[PDB]
Amino acid sequence: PKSMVIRIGAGEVGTSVSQLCTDVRKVMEPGTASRLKERKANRLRDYVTMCGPLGVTHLLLFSRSTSGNVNLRLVVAPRGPTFHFRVEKYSLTKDVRRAQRHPKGGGKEYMTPPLLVMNNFTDPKSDAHSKVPRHLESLTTTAFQSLFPPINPQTTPLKSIRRVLLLNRELSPENDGKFVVNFRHYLITTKPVERRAVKLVELGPRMRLRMTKVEEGLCSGKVLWHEYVSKSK
Amino acid sequence: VTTEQIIERERKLRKIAQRGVVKLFNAVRAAQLKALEAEKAARREGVIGSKQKEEKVTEMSRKGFLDLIAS
Amino acid sequence: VRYAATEIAPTKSARARGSYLRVSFKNTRETAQAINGWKLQRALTFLQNVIDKKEAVPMRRYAGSTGRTAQGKQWGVSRARWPVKSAQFLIGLLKNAEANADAKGLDTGNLIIKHIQVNQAPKQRRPYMSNPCHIELILTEAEETVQKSEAVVR
């Protein structure tokens, strides 16, 4: 499982989005191309035709609209699906380190991918309102479970286990809530109190995602569910 | 004020993530240690030693301990 | 008269036979010659690497020029390939031999392949004829050399 983070979605790039994408790539290490330098003449076609032979399975695209709104498109190579998230609030890794009293610099931990922890997403039916649960949430779970390599607790070295990626859903299984996606990154510190204490340190970035819209293919296909626009039958 | 309250909610869900990380931690450690001890609890080279039976036994073992720790 | 060298002790030895196997005789012969005379763990890891495309079996007698890579340096042969089904069935047969030796009560640590013979099998009468093979391999614990007691004069 390989993933790449690209800014080709935006017409032009700035310092803030560049730092955000650098942080996202750092999160995606070691299964990502760090030296990927985006150029203005490049396009989604060129990047997917690079993903093809490179065996990349997942692609994050950071786009910026003329209004300044930022969108994160999580696509699965090489034929979709596509998930449109909207940026509500974001913080840089530099800002997180500055705010933290004891920031920790990335090190040998770059060799190990983070473990995915997923909270408040409703897989089983609680109200038979299948349209949000049985259409969107299971796809979210599968999409991230495939974004990160499958984790076998019975073979994973605990000393290699060093990073965690939190996806917390502000939403209840009764389809009541703010439908907010919380993306965060934490570093594991194991302290001997065998009884071991696990302390999690913010690494960033903090991401506030609005689950806006979906596509079957790579930036193509019928709208399967759009929050604001429901198409008649 | 309101922002500050947002950051106490921040540490709240931070502690929720901490509990999740800790439970995954001790679940993995206990499952691995117990399954390895159980599989080593045999004869010098096991009762069978042909490895086709032990692979399936080891799979059933991690599965039982994983289910027991999960619920 | 002359006496032929006696066979190694059956309870220091282990035998394995596979008859009517549906793998090419030339490929099986080449793989057997490559793995002949080696340590058991060495042979198993070698065949696993052959499956994993890591190490190559050199062709000497039944050699058809297919690959000329750097993997042939360790054998000094310029023609090396990767017999997959050969490696897999031979792994199965040495695993069977190891199980037989364990049943007989031999030291698993010191099994070495003294003998491996590949013969042709009756042709599969289907003009396109298949070439099945018979493979028999004989393993032993490493030969043991022990101390002398000092001779007493009298």
Architecture blueprint of SSEs:
The structure is cut from a larger assembly and holds chains A (233 residues), B (71 residues) and C (154 residues).
Chain A: E1 3-6, H1 15-28, H2 44-54, E2 58-64, E3 70-76, E4 82-91, H3 93-99, E5 115-119, H4 133-147, E6 163-170, E7 180-192, E8 196-202, E9 206-215
Parallel strand pairs in A: 1-2, 5-6
Antiparallel strand pairs in A: 2-3, 3-4, 4-9, 6-7, 7-8, 7-9
Chain B: H1 2-40, H2 52-70
Helix pairs in contact in B: 1-2
Chain C: E1 13-21, H1 25-35, H2 40-51, E2 57-58, E3 80-81, H3 84-104, E4 111-120, E5 133-141
Helix pairs in contact in C: 2-3
Protein name (chain A): Brix domain-containing protein
Domain Brix (chain A): 3-220
Protein name (chain B): Ribosomal RNA-processing protein 15
Q: Could you describe the 3D structure shown?
A:
Chain C: Belongs to the universal ribosomal protein uL22 family. Chain C: Pfam families: Ribosomal_L22. Chain C: One of its GO terms (biological process) is cytoplasmic translation. Chain C: Keywords: Metal-binding, Ribonucleoprotein, Ribosomal protein. Chain C: One of its GO terms (cellular component) is cytosolic large ribosomal subunit. This is part of a larger assembly, with chains A (233 residues), B (71 residues) and C (154 residues). Chain A is built from 4 helices and 9 strands; from the N terminus they run βααβββαβαββββ. Chain A has helices at 15-28, 44-54, 93-99, 133-147, and strands at 3-6, 58-64, 70-76, 82-91, 115-119, 163-170, 180-192, 196-202, 206-215. Chain A is globular and about 60 Å long. Chain B has 71 residues and is mostly helical. Chain B is rod-shaped, with a radius of gyration of 20 Å. Chain C is built from 3 helices and 5 strands; from the N terminus they run E-H-H-E-E-H-E-E. In chain C, the strands form 2 sheets. A 3-stranded antiparallel sheet of chain C has the order 1-5-4. In chain C, strands 2-3 form a two-stranded antiparallel sheet. In chain C, helix 2 packs antiparallel against helix 3 (84-104). The longest helix of chain C is centred in the middle third of the chain and has 21 residues, at 84-104. Chain A binds chain B through residues 115, 117, 119, 153-154, 156, 158, 161, 164, 166, 168, 182, 184, 186, 188, 196, 198, 200, 202, and chain B through 13-14, 16-18, 20-22, 24-25, 27-29, 31-32, 35, 62, 66.
